A paper describes a structure:
The genomes of most C. perfringens strains contain three separate genes encoding highly conserved GH33 CAZymes targeting sialic acid glycosidic linkages: the nonsecreted 43 kDa NanH, and the two secreted 77 kDa NanI and 129 kDa NanJ. Here, we present the structural and biochemical characterization of the GH33 catalytic domains of the three sialidases of C. perfringens and probe their substrate specificity. The catalytically active domains, which we refer to as NanHGH33, NanJGH33, and NanIGH33, displayed differential activity on various naturally occurring forms of sialic acid. We report the X-ray crystal structures of these domains in complex with relevant sialic acid variants revealing the molecular basis of how each catalytic domain accommodates different sialic acids.
In contrast to NanHGH33 and NanJGH33 binding Neu5,9Ac2, the binding of this monosaccharide to NanIGH33 caused a structural rearrangement in the active site. The side chain of W354 swivels approximately 180o, which in turn allows the sidechain of F353 to move ∼90o clockwise and occupy the vacated space. This opens up the 9-O-Ac binding pocket that was otherwise blocked by F353 allowing Neu5,9Ac2 to be bound by NanIGH33 in a conformation similar to that observed in the NanHGH33 complex. The inability of NanIGH33 to recognize 7-O-Ac modified sialic acid in any capacity is likely due to the F353/W354 combination. When the 9-O-Ac pocket is unoccupied it appears that W354 blocks the region that would otherwise accommodate a 7-O-Ac (this position is the smaller P472 residue in NanJGH33). Though W354 moves when binding a ligand with a 9-O-Ac, the rotation of F353 would cause its sidechain to block 7-O-Ac binding. NanIGH33 was most stringent being entirely unable to accommodate 7-O-Ac modification and was comparatively poor at hydrolyzing Neu5Gc variants.
Residue numbers in the entry: 1243 to 1690
């Protein structure tokens, strides 16, 4: 229709960009200053997930609303097939700090062979990263100084990137397949930040000790973006979606969150904790032993009164949605299935929209509208209150009033952002692992 805007797709990442053969897992965020930040997995040896790869994090910035992009940069690189995989972007608007979080594996590990727990150990009241030598002997890193199992200082020290130094000389890296001392083989949540709108980034912070429990096997970023809560008693809280597996390997969604500008983090309950399944059964993410109720990758959006809605990848064939009245710490016992929104077991994206649509508050949603990874569709969901819960909190439902096909053919992971002009930017997996595509869409297009 006249006035509609749907730009010709541009390959924001692609074979050869930054000398990476492959790319996957898009993330896209407009900062408060108005810059677009796009992060991606730079997969160096094919499209495969960890451990069968060597994956780095890359970033591109646009300062003119997505029309042109900078030459990019690798911001996280571990050696020897130690991977960083699945990034997520959020900003603290009060301090102007941008956060990027990612899952990290030592060489040879990934979601299915991850060992149990955080890989940290408590000594006299402080968590310390554990290291292991060839014979199984366990060490701790105390302010980057390696102590043996008798709290004897050794000759070894580390840095944030895991380099291992013997008397101040680098010999290896605790994440490699060859280091004399290796970190525990498991998932780690890593955090970097930018104070200059994304131009430069800090070294990775290993926050596993605050968010990974003893009984979790894998705990990883649910890729895409986070939020900072805008209304109510938890305003200012930074919410980052995650998901984890238990001993039996079953997956459950959650968010980690910080109320002190990213300094400390906690993990909330999963919507699977005390979940009431359809016919009344009560399960828990800790004990979950069946595949059916699994909740995995997810993204979160805020309702007008500050209530949280977690959109979750799952195994029912349809979108699943959890609700939290307490800023992400727990969820209502009922997980809703929207049979208006197919979910073929793939990552999805959902963001708040800043302006009313047809007089209603709205969200924007992206995913493959099929039983396969195809038929990529952006939707406008209008929020309606439909009564209240027993506890008197409002009950919110979505009306998927506008549904627009934007990518025929292959469509997998995606990430949305609202643009300074009020339009919608989208970075999506239009190929399985090569070209990653960026387009801009106005609501006139989406409503057509
Ligand atoms: C492997 C990983 O850390 N992330 C990958 C994730 C994951 O393997 C999938 O969610 C299943 O997780 C679990 C714990 O069973 O899913 C993808 O493999 C996919 O596109 O299906 C891409 C993504 O990078
Ligand atoms: Na690397
Ligand atoms: Na560390």
């Amino acid at each position: 229709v006249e006035g509609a805007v749907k730009t010709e797709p541009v390959d924001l990442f692609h074979p050869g960009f930054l000398n990476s053969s492959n790319y996957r897992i898009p993330a896209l965020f407009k900062t408060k200053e108005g810059t677009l930040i796009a992060s991606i997995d730079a997969r160096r040896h094919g499209g495969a997930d960890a451990p069968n790869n060597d994956i780095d994090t890359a970033v591109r910035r646009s300062e003119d609303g997505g029309k042109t992009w900078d030459e990019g940069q690798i911001i996280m690189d571990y050696p020897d097939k130690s991977s960083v995989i699945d990034t997520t972007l959020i900003e603290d608007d009060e301090t102007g700090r941008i956060f990027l979080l990612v899952t990290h594996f030592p060489s040879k590990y990934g979601f299915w062979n991850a060992g149990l727990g955080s890989g940290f150990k408590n000594i006299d009241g402080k968590e310390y990263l554990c290291l292991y030598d060839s014979s199984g002997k366990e060490f701790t890193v105390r302010e980057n100084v390696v102590y043996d199992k008798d709290s004897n200082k050794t000759e070894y020290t580390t840095n944030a990137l895991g380099d291992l130094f013997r008397n101040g000389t680098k010999i290896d890296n605790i994440n490699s397949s060859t280091a004399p001392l290796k970190a525990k083989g498991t998932s780690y949540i890593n955090l970097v930040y930018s104070d200059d709108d994304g131009k430069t980034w800090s070294e990775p912070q290993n926050i596993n000790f605050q968010v990974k429990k003893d009984w979790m096997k894998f705990l990883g970023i649910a890729p895409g973006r986070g939020i900072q809560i805008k209304n109510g008693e938890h305003k200012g809280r930074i919410v980052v979606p995650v998901y984890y597996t238990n001993e039996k390997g079953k997956q459950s969604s959650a968010v980690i969150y910080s109320d002190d500008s990213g300094k400390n983090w906690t993990i909330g309950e999963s919507p699977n904790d005390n979940r009431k399944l359809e016919n009344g059964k009560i399960i828990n993410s800790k004990t979950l032993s069946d595949d059916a109720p699994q909740l995995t990758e997810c993204q979160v959006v805020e309702m007008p009164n500050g209530q949280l809605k977690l959109f979750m990848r799952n195994l029912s064939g349809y979108l699943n949605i959890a609700t939290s009245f307490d800023g992400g710490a727990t969820w209502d016992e009922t997980v809703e299935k929207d049979t208006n929104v197919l979910e073929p077991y793939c990552q999805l994206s959902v963001i708040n929209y800043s302006q009313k649509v047809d007089g209603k508050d709205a969200v924007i949603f992206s995913n493959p509208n099929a039983r396969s990874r195809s038929n990529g569709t952006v939707r406008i969901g209008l929020i309606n209150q439909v009564g209240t819960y027993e506890n008197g909190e409002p009950k919110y439902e979505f009306d998927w009033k506008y549904n627009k096909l934007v990518k025929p053919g292959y469509y997998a992971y995606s990430c949305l952002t609202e643009l300074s002009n009020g339009n919608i930017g989208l970075l999506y997996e239009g190929t399985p692992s090569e070209e990653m595509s960026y387009i801009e869409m106005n609501l006139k297009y989406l409503e057509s």
